[PDB]
Each structure stands twice: as C-alpha cells, then as structure tokens.
Design a protein around this ligand. Structure first.
Ligand SMILES: Nc1ncnc2c1ncn2[C@@H]1O[C@@H](COP(=O)(O)OP(=O)(O)OP(O)(O)=S)[C@H](O)[C@H]1O
Ligand SMILES: Nc1ncnc2c1ncn2[C@H]1O[C@@H](COP(=O)(O)OP(=O)(O)OP(O)(O)=S)[C@H](O)[C@H]1O
Ligand SMILES: Nc1ncnc2c1ncn2[C@H]1O[C@@H](COP(=O)(O)OP(=O)(O)OP(O)(O)=S)[C@H](O)[C@H]1O
Ligand SMILES: Nc1ncnc2c1ncn2[C@H]1O[C@H](COP(=O)(O)OP(=O)(O)O)[C@H](O)[C@H]1O
Ligand SMILES: Nc1ncnc2c1ncn2[C@H]1O[C@H](COP(=O)(O)OP(=O)(O)O)[C@H](O)[C@H]1O
Lengths: 578, 232, 578, 346
C-alpha cells in the first residue's frame, strides 16, 4: 500500500515530524481510546493552527521513537493518502481497487492504524468526484469490528456536521478537544524550530524578538490563532531579511523587526506598538480639546478614570469602565466618544436605545435563546463584543431603553460577560461602556406659572438620580456633565462647516468669502442652547449653499470666480455674483 | 445482495453477535409476529442504547444455535446496508434496478428474513427524487403478500414522526416495545459480556467494580441508557 | 406486459388470492362505470385496510369463478408493477418506449383491464428532466377516448394530496367510495376467509371465537379499520395456537384465546380477573391501609372504583374513575395516589398543575395548531395517555391551574377522549383520574367575631363549590374531604418513618434499635395538628439521623455495627450507643 | 350523467328489464354520484321517518319539543321542501345540565343510521386554533394536513354535526359558522369547498345556567328564567343568532321523568350482567326508593347514575369478584320497611 497511504512512523523516521510540544494529555487520550475494544477510534477535533495535525503526527512520532505503551505494541500509523489513491487514474475503477486494497492490507496488518487527515473533506466523494464516494461506507463496518483503528481529523465546526451526520461513525469515534498553546508555549514552539528558521533564513532571532512575535501578535493578528501567526511573523522577519539585503550583515532579528513585520500585516505596531502606556492617554485630555471645545472637565474626568483602570485598579472579571454622559444635545457628547476611540486605537460599537424600547427588540439585542436575530446574530450586542473585544460601546439615549435592556447591562457590568443564544460568550473585560441621555437638561426648558416667571434651572444630577435607579448608579465609574457651548466655540463650529464648503467650492474653482459678522451670525442663529450646535448643519446647508448652487447650475456662474457674502444690517446674506 | 447484505448466521458461526442476556420476552413476541401469515414484519421500537439492535442480532444467533422452534429452522437473517444500496447511482433506472435485484435474491428463498435498521430512513420515500416512486412504493405490495419477512428497527420519536402518517406502512408492521434494563439487569448484561472485555484488555474486574460501574453511571451519567453507558 | 404485469386470472385459477365476500353494491357500480362509453375508469378511494385492493382483485376471482355478468366474462385483469417499468431505463427513449409498448399491447387486447395499486404514484411518473412528460400526462388520451380501461386505487389522503390536484387527470376517473363494513358483515368476511387461517396455522376456531374477535376489536382497538382489525386478531390467535404444538400442546382457538390476544393491546384482560388476580384485588384495600393511616374513605373510594371496573360493571366510555381529593396539608392526598399506582403495578403519570398558570398554556397539553412554531412538537397529555393506556393520572394542585384549563377535563371526564393537534384521539377509558386540592382549607381556619362565637364547618364545601363550575363539579365520581391527623395516627406515622430509616441504615451495614419510650417522646415532641404528618420527618432527621451521620461518616460506627437509642427519663433526652 | 344512466340502463337487461331512460333514472344516477339520498323517501324510509319522533322518546324523557324540532327539520328536507342552500337545520340547545342536551343528538344520529361528527369546542379556546378547522395558509408548516372540519365534512356529506360546549370556544371561532349556516359552504386552505347542505348542525351550550340558578335578595323570589335574554344575547353576535332556526330550552327533570330515568339505567345494568351469565331483578318498591333517594332537581339525571352505582353495582361487584354470585345464580333486590335497606341473593 506504498501508494495508498503514508507511513507516518516512517515519515517521523526521516525527519518530517517534529516532537509534539505541549498537549501531552491529548496524545494520551488518543491512546486510551485506541486501547478500547469498541468505539475505539480517536478523533482529533481542532482547527488549523492549534495542533490538530501536529498531534496526529506526534502519535506517529512517539511510535517511531518507541515512546509507546506495550499496549500498541509495534503499531504503524499510516496517513490516508487520498491524493495518491486518485492520482494516475482519476476513476472509480482504480480508486476503488486501491482503496479497498488499502483497507484490506490495513485490516490484515497487526495493529495498523489509519489516520485520516482532514477526514471532514472525504465526506463528499473520497479524494474527488469519480473516486470512492462510498469510502465512508467501507470504513463504517471495519470500525464497527475494530479491524483498523482509525484516527480522525476534523475541525470544531466540521465535527458537529460530519460525525453527527452518521451514527455509524459518530458512535465509533471519541472526541478530543484540541486547543492552542499559551504565550510561553508559542515561544517554546518557535524555539523548538528556531534553529531551522535561523538555518532557513540565515538569520538569528533574539530572545526578545521571539517573545515579541508572540506577545505582539496577540494584539494585532486578531482572527487566526497565535501559534501560526507568531510563526508567520518569525518566518516573514527571516524571509524578509534574507530577500532584502539585511541578513547578509544584520543577521539578528530584533523586536523592531518583529514590530515592522507585524505592522506589514496590521499596520499598527511600527508606529503604535507602545508609545505611552500612560502618556498617550494623559495627552488625550489635551488632544480631545483640539477638536472638542468645552466640556474640558468631562474629558479630563474620563481620562482619569481610564488611567485608573490601566493602573490595575479593579477586578479580573470586570469591564474597563462605565460612564453616563449627561447633558444637552449638540455639545459634542458623541464627538468625545469618537475621538477617544480613535486616539485609543479601538473600534466604536453603537446601539440606539430608542430601538430597544420594546420587549421584543430587547431579546434581539441580547441574543436570548428565543427571539434572537438570525440563527446566531445573536445577539447583536454579543456579536459586537466578540468581534471587537477592546472596543468602546456606546449606548445612545439610554432612558428610552426597555427595562430588560437596562437589566442585561447591569448583569454585564457585574460579571463582564454576555451569553449568546448559541452558548457563545462575549467578553466585556476589555471594553468601555459609554451611556448617553438628554434628560438631565429637559426640566430647565420649562417656563413657570405666575406673574413673575422664575428660574427653573435644576440640578441635572438630581434629575439623573430620579430617572435612573441606584443599582445602576452604584455601578458607574462616573456621571459626567457635558455643558452648553460658548460663543467662541460656536464660531469654531461654524468655521469648520464653512471650511468644508470652501473645500468643495475650491474643487469647482470658486472662492467664497464669508464676513465675520456672517460667521458669527450663522453660529448664533443655528445654535440653540437646548440642541446645542446640532442645527448648525442646516443653518449652513441652506444659507451658504442654495444661493450659490443655483448660479452654477443656471449658468451665470462659471467654474472660477470670487464671491463674498456679507452679513448686512438686516441680517440678510449680502451675496454677490462672482 | 453481494455488497448490500450480510448473512448474520454466518457471522454468528464465525464469532459475530453476542448472545442475549435476559431478553426472552422480546424474542417470544418477535417469533409470534414472524409466524403470522400476513404482516409478519416485526418492528422494534426503542431508545438508543437499550439493546434495540442487539435483539435482532440475537435472533440470528439463536437460530444458529438451535435455540428457536423448528418453525424458524434454516432461516437466515441478513442485515441490509442502505448506504451501499443507495450510493453510486444518479441515473433514472438505477434505484429501480438495484433494489429489484436485491429483492429477487430474497424472494427466491422461503426462509429468508431481511433486517433493516434505520427503518424510518426508508420512510419518506428514502432516496427518492421527483415524485413518489419511493422505496416505500416498491415495498408495500410485497409486505401485503407475505413474500418477504422484514424485521424493522427504530426509535419512538422517529417512529411517530414517519410511521402512522404513511398509514399503509404502519399497518403492515407489528410494533414491539424495547425497554431499558434495570440496574440489576445491567449488571447481568455486563457479567455475561464481561469475558470479552477482560480478554481484550488483559484485565480482571472485581464484583464491586462491576456493580459500581452500573450504580455510578446511573447517579452521574445522564445522556443515555444503561446497556450503553455502564458498559462504556 | 410480459415482464411488467400479472394476469390476475392466473392467481384466481390457482388459489393465489383470497376470495371476496359481499360488496355487492361496490361491484355493482364498478361494472356500470366500466360499461360507459367514455372515461370508463373506476377509481377506488377509501380508508386503509377496508378492502379496496381486496375488491379490485376480488373481481378477477369472480370472473374466473363465473360469478360475474357475461359482459365481464372472459375479461382479463392485469396488475401493474411500476418499479419494474423504470428499472434499468437509462437513456432517453427507453422509458417512453417501454411504456408505449405496454399500452399498445393492451389497446390490441381489447378485452382487458389494467389495474393499478397506488395510482397516485403514476402522477409524477418518471420525469427525464425539464420536460415534464411523465407516465402520466402521456398516459391520458386513451382514457378519454375509451380505447383502454383502467381501475384505480388510492387512500383518501393520497387522493386529496396527490392527484386531488391534477384536474385533467382526475376528471378521467370515476370515484367510488369504499366504506368500512358493519359488524355482521365483518363476521361473515371472517367466516369465509377463516379456512385459509385454519389451514395455514393448523388450527380450528369456534363460532364464539370469531364473534369475539370482531366485537372485541371494535370495543378495544382504536387506530384501524374494523375488518383489518378482526382479521389481525384471528391471525394472531391462530399463530398463538400454532406455537402451542411445538411441545405438542395441540388445541383449537376459543374465546379465552381471543380475549388474551385483544387484551395484549387493551391491557386489561377480562378473564385473569377470575384467577389469582382476584386476590390481588381482594387485598388492595389493606395493602394501602398499611401505608396510609386513617382516611379510609379515600381508600375505599379508589378501591371500589377499580373493582367495579374489573368486575365488568363499567361506564362504557367514561374513565375508570374520577376523584377530587381535598383537605388540609400533610394528610396523604398525593401519598395515597402514588401508593395506589404501586399497589396495582401500573404507571403513574404526573402532571404539575402549577405549571399551567395561564390560559394559553393549554397548548402545552394538546399541541400548537398547524402553521405555528412547535406544531410538530407534540402535546404532553395526549402523548402520555396514548403511550401508556393503563395508568393512574395525577394532577397536582388542581386549583393552581388557570381555571380555563378545567374545560379540557370536562371533555375527558365525560366522554373518555381528548383530540390532539393531528386529529388523533387519546383514550382514557383505562385511566384512573385523581385531582388534588386544598382549596377549602383556609376558610375553616377563620375566627369569628362577636359575643356568640357562631359555628362554621360548612365552608369547606362552599368554597369548593364556587371554584368548580357545576358542569365540572357534577361530573366527578366523588369528592373526598380529608381530615387532620390525630395523635393515634402520629404514633403510626412515627413507626413508618423509623422503619424507612432502618432500611436506609441496613444498606450501610448498620442496624438500629429504638425503644418505646424514645418513640413516644418523638411522637409528642413532633406532633402539630396544623401541619399534618409531614413534620414528623423533621423531628426524626434531627433526633436520629444527624447523630448517626457523624458516627457513620467519620468511622466510629461502621458496616458491621449496631446502634441503639432509648429515652433517658431523667434528662428527657435520647441516649445513643453502639 | 347521461352516459352513466345509459350504461346503467343497459344492464337492466340482466334481469331482462329493458327500458327507456327517463327522469327517474337520471335522478337516481345524480343522487348516487353526489352521494345524496332522494328516491327512497317513497319507500320503507317513509316509516323510518314517520316513527322517528317516537323512537327517540323511548330514550330521552321530557324535552319533547327538542325532539319535535329535530324531527321536523328532517322531514321537510326529505319531503323536498327544504331550503336551497343551507344546512338541514341549525339548532342551539340550551338549559340546565344533565338533561339530554348532548344525548338527544347522539341518539338522533343512531336513529337515522348516519355518521356523527363530533367536535369539542373546549379545545378551541384560543384564536389561532381556528387554523385547525381550516388548515394552514400555503407556505406554512402544517400546510399538508388540511383542516379538520372541512376534511370531515367531505368524507361524510350526510351526517349530524355536533359542536359541544360552543360557548367555550374563543368567540372569534364562531365567525366561521356564519358562512356555514347561511350559505352551506366553507373553504379550506387548498381552495376546496365543504358542502354542508346535507348535514344537521347542532350546537349545545350552558350559557346562562349559573345565573338562572341564583337566588335573589328580597321578600319575593324572582323568576330567573330569562337567561336567554341576557347571556345568550351577550355571547352570540346578532348576525349569528339571526341565522339560527331555533334556540331550544331544555327543562329540569321532574319526578315522573326521574322514575323513567331510573328504569332506563336499571336496564343498562341488566345488560352488563347478562353478559356475565347472571341476572338481576328489582322490586318496584326498591325502585321507588332509589329514585327518591337519588333525586336532585339541581343536576338533572346526572346523579341518578351514582345512586345506582352505590346501591346496586358496588354490592354486585363484590359478589361477582369474590365468588358469591358467579356462574349458577341470580340476584333479587327488594326493600325492607324497617331501615329501607335492600336485599340481595343467589
Ligand atoms: N369483503 C371482503 N372479503 C374478503 N376479504 C376482505 C373483504 N374486505 C376486506 N377484506 C380484507 O382486506 C385485505 C387488506 O385489503 P386492503 O384494505 O384492500 O389493502 P389496501 O387497500 O392495500 O390497504 P392500504 O395499502 O393500507 S390503503 C385483507 O387481506 C382482506 O381479507
Ligand atoms: N395519614 C398518613 N398516613 C401515612 N403516611 C402519611 C399520612 N399523611 C402523610 N403521610 C406521608 O406522606 C407525605 C406527606 O403527605 P402528602 O400526601 O405527600 O402531602 P399532600 O397532602 O399530598 O400535599 P400537601 O402539599 O401536604 S397539601 C410524607 O411522606 C408523610 O407525611
Ligand atoms: N331527560 C332525560 N331522559 C333520558 N335520559 C337522560 C335525560 N337527561 C339526561 N339523560 C342521560 O344522558 C346522559 C348524560 O348526558 P347529557 O344529559 O346530554 O348531559 P347534558 O345535558 O348534555 O348536559 P352537559 O353537556 O353534561 S352540561 C346520561 O346517560 C343521562 O343523564
Ligand atoms: N465641539 C463641538 N461641539 C458640538 N458640536 C460640534 C462640535 N464640533 C462639531 N460639531 C457639529 O456636531 C454636531 C452634532 O453633534 P452630535 O454629538 O454628533 O449629535 P447631537 O448633536 O444630536 O448631540 C453638529 O453636526 C455640529 O455642531
Ligand atoms: N440483554 C443483552 N444481552 C447482550 N447484549 C446486549 C443486551 N442488551 C444490549 N446489548 C448490547 O447493545 C447495547 C447497546 O444497545 P443497542 O441495541 O446497540 O442500541 P441501538 O439499537 O440504538 O444501536 C451494547 O452494544 C450491548 O451491550
């Protein structure tokens, strides 16, 4: 069966297979299963990059080395070679004869074990359509009799659809859960192969570089497991140095080369692997002030709370933090959240609580076993916090949330996790919860009764106390007030809009001068203490655009030209042609 | 039938099938059904892991050993592999040709019994595509004549979801309830089967170890029935 | 047709088919259809197992035997095997050719009829592909013109779901409804078929056995047509007797054997009642009195209902009995029911009424309607009853269910049936229904106000009467009001609890002796009229079990030991030793 | 119809009855095709119908008017003076419990020899369960089941349709019957139409019973017989009621009736005993005693079955099960005067 299956003891005998590093109990569990009289076929269930193949290889390695129980005893694990069974013929006639001959020889051989790598891929048609579409049917009865012990290989999602598909195999194979190695284990596997990588690329890696490949990859690779990505970083640093005129002089690969390599894929660490674990944040109070003008104490308060969380003050199961942002609309509450997420290098996740106002929508957000989105949404909230674990979560206008939302959030605040309808869990230990609400200032908008009107200003913090429960308040890191905007700020806002208009006019070729009185006026007219600067979008969208758009379109105006609008004494846009 | 069915009597002679321990009542009923002139097609309905398959196999074993009334003498109970029967077709006349050939090789006997596990798979027309002509519609006319005796096997849940809907197939089978053995019975089952565990493993089990395996499985293992888990 | 159809006259001539008995009008109409100028194709439609096929083949039998009108004389009826018609038709044209050839041979016979069983199956006759020409559309024109005559056969369900849609085809057939036979007709059918069974099984049947088989099946077997239902009883009884002379117990079949066979399905024989089962019933009252102290009325009500039903003085269709047990807590209301099921050896079905606290929860008992989530999940009450027809049904807390649920019971108590969401009927005639309640208790605990403390004690019944609507209330066999337990009862209660402890300790290898004084002490210490018997279990856990737990658990008292308890009269404390 | 009448007439010659095809043959053929009875009304069925009213009076005592209402609706339909497109009749029986409201319907179906289609309206207490009568809309899960009501009426076109305890169905379910009662049809989920022109629709209710039995406050007891005026009117929408043929009130059972009821139940007991080989005789005095003892105006005939169960069936069950009265004996029940207790024997 030299062209039907690969002898893996023999492969291990000729290099091929490295000793397995870690997952010793997985190798032993497979042995414990192989030793059973029925339902004695182990299955390795993993995913690429966590050692699922390496374990099967490790079993063969142990055998060639004699590192086996006498209960084995002189076995010989072979890997089904679906390629070789098909190759050279591509027809059922010979695939079938070769496959059946393979099984007959394996059934006949003392203690032969057949490892089928990627067993979840022969579920379709054997190696390929035209080959043994019934390979599974031939295997079912030999497994049932125990003629050939078979070692399976599937992935976590493939198992549930491949073995559970047919009881003739589900009831024969035992499931072994294979998970990834740790940071130091990843370093050990790199160090295990390090001599090869160094030989292969004519480079040398520092101890720090190897650790950095692992320690940094977990912050940037995100989706694929670490064991391979840290290695890809080591191979890319090596390969890059060998290709580029580097390793011929600078054989050594340092952490900086690892940072450059991870950045080649993530584009982060070469500029941002770690600038100021404390200062990029303290500088944020001032960085935010460059875009958000006002609410200075609010941004400083957030900065202090984040700095405290980073100090390690808290618990291992808790979120980074939770804040309620109270105040008028149009004062930059969302602007602060956005600028913080950018500065901190994280994603912003957003939900509008007014859309989670009714009981049904509440279950869709949660991913409650019933009443969830799709089949595994779930859980709009759980998904968002699984895909982006270090993100900032913004919940808008929170007083409009249905009470069940309010309670799921309290449960998350207490334990750091949210369970999906499919049993999967979101990890909130790395996120910041930002909750907003425009209720604390609505009372002061009221006009009183009486011959003399009075001042209806209130303490917005007391209004928050009445609206929200104390269980909720006691779990917040803070309540932060974002106040109304000053005159110079509304000027900064109107100028930002005017500048964008000018950029668009520059693209066309028209120059627009806006007098200072007009700039002030638009800012004062658009701004409404209750809605802040929110309405500024329209005071400009119509006043500085409609009258100009029309001339260009009518044809009196051309691509070039210089137009000014001055505010006159009647507050009427004093426009000119061009 | 050459690559579709297994002669279970031949297997019982080779080694094959384990003897049944304590299932005489189920066997008495299976014989009562097979000995009828019409609809002599027992169906074993149970839960997985309760000896539901073991019983049908057990009958073949008993026939081989001469542990049956002479009425059953010389009968052969071959097990049918649906997978190999349906795989490898894709043409219009394939399912009607292969199946009929199988039946002819059973029809020619008078003492042949067919054992079909996963009987409810056949229900719903089995591997039939495009408009009736299901294996069911090939089978009904035979069951009605008594030409082929069929022993079925399924579970309670599958039994009610497939059968008793296609009513004509419900009245053509005789249902037998296969329950789950008690703790004491499970111990008896382990001890009768025990010599092969000891032989495979080169171990010896104590009396306490056997009873404990059953009692501990009852107390702590809750996803299945005893003939499977205590043994496991 | 040489390898596709059977000339049925061939079977009629060699005894290959059983004779047709009766069905004069069915055959009368079928002939008139065949005698029509156009579309002369009768179709037999009916319930399964009523002889539809028997009639169609029965005609071939009658033609051969000369039992038909000259018109039919010398006609041939052929039976078609559809599977053999498709088998092997690989390649376009083979299927169209075989089919056409068959029809041509029939068209040229001119004096023959084609009979098709499962005529629904030809509806989507083999389809090559996009082209829809199938055994059916092509096989039309001939039915219309009168060139050929066919006989159809299908069930009511297949007829309505299958073809009951192809109008062009359906209009070419005349539908004849085949109904189920009467009792007298069924007996005659059995008498004429009987000699085949007598011969097959080497048996003879008495006249009484035949009448019993038909009438008993009608009374006790619910899911089948009566004729197929009577035949099945006779054949099983035959087979039962056939397996007697294996030890040479040769005998004929009589009523007692028929009764045993039907009883196998009904679960209550009418004959064993006269044997040792007379003592099982005779002693029922005492086996239970030894377990439940006092409350003889409950024991008698249950015991007598069972005896009448077994005696044969039943209710035709009502349940074995229906009782409401009402009273103070801790007095054995559910305890007696549980013990009854044990004493009788039958399943106890328990439902907790507190889980059906809302009107809509009723779908949980009987199933969701078609089209609604959970439709195919079942219905808990009807499944339990169908699966276990001989049982004790206990509904705990009959007052904690939403009141609308009582309306389901009205139908069951009065008629013996409940229908599920698939139209199947649960049969409760062999069920003992017990409902428990403490509804009238609080009302009699009420204190009066005034100088002349007026008496109450009628309120127990007045409260019950205003809870259950009269149509429910008068549909019960009885209402048993339970009393409080007295101290004499407690002495008996303590004795049974001590015995349970002794058994529990015997299992650990330790015996226990308790003196009379120790028992009297516990009885007085524990008795509380207000809470019934239940609290005696607590006085025992603290006085006997806790001391033992420490001696047994930490080694001073071990398997092989004995322990003794007595009252120390000076201390009014129990002693312990071993 | 013409081709079949021809083919049929052509076989009349088997007995040599050669003839011209005339309307009478056409009517017979249409009637056979559609499964609708018609010509036999002229035959022995005249007596089956003529004596229907009396045969039922041997089963239900009192309630003569209910029997007359049912009997007449049937005779008109058979006579030919029926309606053009309505059920044979639509009745709503009402009254105190245990008075034969559902029993008379059952016995009618037996007396006439036709199927009883019986539905329990207590199972349709939710709105969405109306789908069980009609079937799911296309594209849904239960689509292939069909409706249960439309389905039963197609298989058995000539039948008595009984809907028990109609007041317990969710009221929207009543809307289905508006087209049934007025137009004779109902359409299922595949577009097939059930045709009710040959069935008798009987609905029974307890509406108003709890109220009619209530005691008033005052010196003069009030007459609470007008429950029809409140509960029936409040439950059934005007359009429902205006389509009914008759609302028939069953009465309470008077003493004379009870005596007949007791005799009826004794006969049922005698039949069960004959089947076990023993027989029972009862003295008239004993019967008068049982009737008086068991009598309760408030629950109709229901309790009479219990006075018999305790005074006759229970004693016998012990005699039958423990050997005193088994094969070889007979039992005589008589009343003494001293305790007014019953005798037994062999
Ligand atoms: N009048 C009769 N005379 C003799 N045998 C009868 C008569 N009526 C019914 N039978 C019995 O009916 C046969 C079963 O017949 P059918 O009901 O016609 O089969 P079926 O139509 O194929 O039932 P399906 O496939 O479940 S719908 C039994 O073998 C007959 O003995
Ligand atoms: N009269 C009795 N004779 C013998 N055992 C009894 C008696 N009463 C109660 N028991 C025992 O049965 C249990 C308590 O009575 P139960 O019948 O189970 O309670 P219940 O009446 O059904 O329900 P509630 O909640 O008390 S109303 C305990 O195991 C014992 O107290
Ligand atoms: N007037 C009567 N004459 C003869 N038998 C009667 C009469 N009334 C009742 N029955 C019997 O009819 C059976 C009970 O059925 P029904 O009286 O129809 O109950 P009901 O009147 O329909 O009232 P519901 O539905 O229980 S509230 C019993 O056998 C007897 O009560
Ligand atoms: N420092 C600032 N403060 C307030 N608004 C600003 C600022 N800079 C730009 N804007 C603009 O943001 C506003 C919208 O603010 P946002 O917080 O996103 O929603 P909302 O106004 O409803 O609170 C207007 O588009 C415009 O005033
Ligand atoms: N009474 C018995 N005597 C001998 N072997 C038995 C007996 N009962 C069960 N078995 C055997 O069957 C057990 C599991 O039940 P099985 O019939 O295989 O479930 P299933 O039919 O669902 O596949 C074990 O494989 C084996 O012990």
């Amino acid at each position: 069966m030299e062209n039907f299956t690969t002898n893996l003891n023999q492969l291990a005998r000729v290099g091929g297979i490295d000793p397995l590093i870690g997952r010793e109990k997985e190798l032993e569990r497979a042995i414990q299963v192989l030793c059973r009289r029925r339902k004695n076929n182990p299955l390795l269930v993993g995913e690429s990059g966590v050692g699922k193949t390496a374990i099967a290889e490790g079993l063969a390695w142990r055998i060639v080395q004699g590192d086996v129980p006498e209960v084995m005893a002189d076995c010989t694990i072979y890997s089904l070679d679906i390629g070789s069974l098909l190759a050279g013929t591509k027809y059922r006639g010979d695939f079938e004869k070769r496959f059946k001959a393979l099984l007959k020889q394996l059934e006949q051989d003392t203690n032969s074990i057949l490892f089928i790598d990627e067993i979840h891929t022969i579920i379709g048609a054997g190696a390929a359509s035209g080959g043994q579409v019934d390979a599974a049917n031939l295997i079912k009865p030999l497994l049932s009799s125990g003629k050939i012990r078979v070692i399976g290989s599937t992935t976590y999602q493939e198992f549930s659809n491949i073995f559970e598909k047919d009881r003739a195999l589900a009831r024969r194979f035992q499931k072994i859960d294979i998970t990834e190695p740790s940071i130091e284990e990843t370093v050990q596997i790199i160090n295990g192969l390090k001599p090869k990588y160094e030989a292969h690329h004519d480079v040398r890696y520092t101890a720090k570089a190897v650790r950095a490949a692992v320690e940094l990859a977990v912050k940037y690779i995100n989706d694929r497991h670490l064991p391979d990505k840290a290695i890809d970083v080591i191979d890319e640093a090596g390969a890059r140095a060998r290709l580029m005129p580097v390793s011929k002089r600078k054989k050594t690969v340092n952490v900086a080369d690892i940072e450059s390599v991870v950045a080649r894929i993530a584009r982060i660490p070469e500029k941002s692997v770690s600038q100021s674990d404390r200062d990029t944040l303290k500088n944020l109070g001032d960085r935010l002030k460059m875009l958000v003008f006002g609410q200075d104490k609010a941004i400083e308060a957030l900065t202090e709370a984040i700095k405290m969380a980073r100090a390690g003050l808290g618990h291992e199961h808790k979120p980074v933090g939770s804040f309620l942002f109270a105040g008028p609309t149009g004062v930059g509450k969302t602007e602060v959240t956005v600028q913080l997420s950018k500065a901190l290098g994280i994603e912003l996740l957003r939900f509008d609580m007014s859309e989670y106002m009714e009981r049904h929508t509440v279950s869709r957000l949660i991913g409650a076993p019933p009443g969830y989105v799709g089949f595994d949404q779930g859980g709009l909230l759980t998904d968002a916090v699984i895909k982006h674990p270090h993100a900032v979560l913004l919940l808008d206008e929170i007083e409009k949330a249905h009470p069940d939302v309010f309670n799921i959030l309290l449960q998350v605040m207490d334990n750091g996790t949210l369970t999906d309808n499919n049993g999967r869990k979101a990890d909130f230990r790395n996120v910041v919860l930002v909750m907003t609400t425009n209720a604390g200032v609505r009372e002061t908008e009221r006009k009183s009764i009486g011959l003399i009107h009075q001042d209806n200003s209130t303490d917005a913090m007391e209004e928050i106390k009445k609206i929200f429960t104390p269980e909720f308040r006691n779990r917040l890191d803070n309540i932060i007030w974002f106040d109304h905007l000053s005159t110079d700020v509304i000027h900064q806002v109107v100028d930002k809009f005017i500048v964008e208009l000018q950029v668009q006019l520059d693209q066309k070729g028209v120059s627009l001068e806006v007098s200072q009185e007009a700039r002030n006026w638009l800012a004062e007219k658009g701004y409404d203490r209750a809605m802040g600067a929110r309405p500024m979008a329209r005071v400009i969208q119509d006043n500085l655009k409609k009258p100009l758009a029309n001339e260009l379109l009518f044809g009196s105006l051309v691509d070039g030209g210089q137009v000014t609008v001055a505010l006159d004494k009647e507050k009427n846009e004093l426009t000119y042609g061009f």
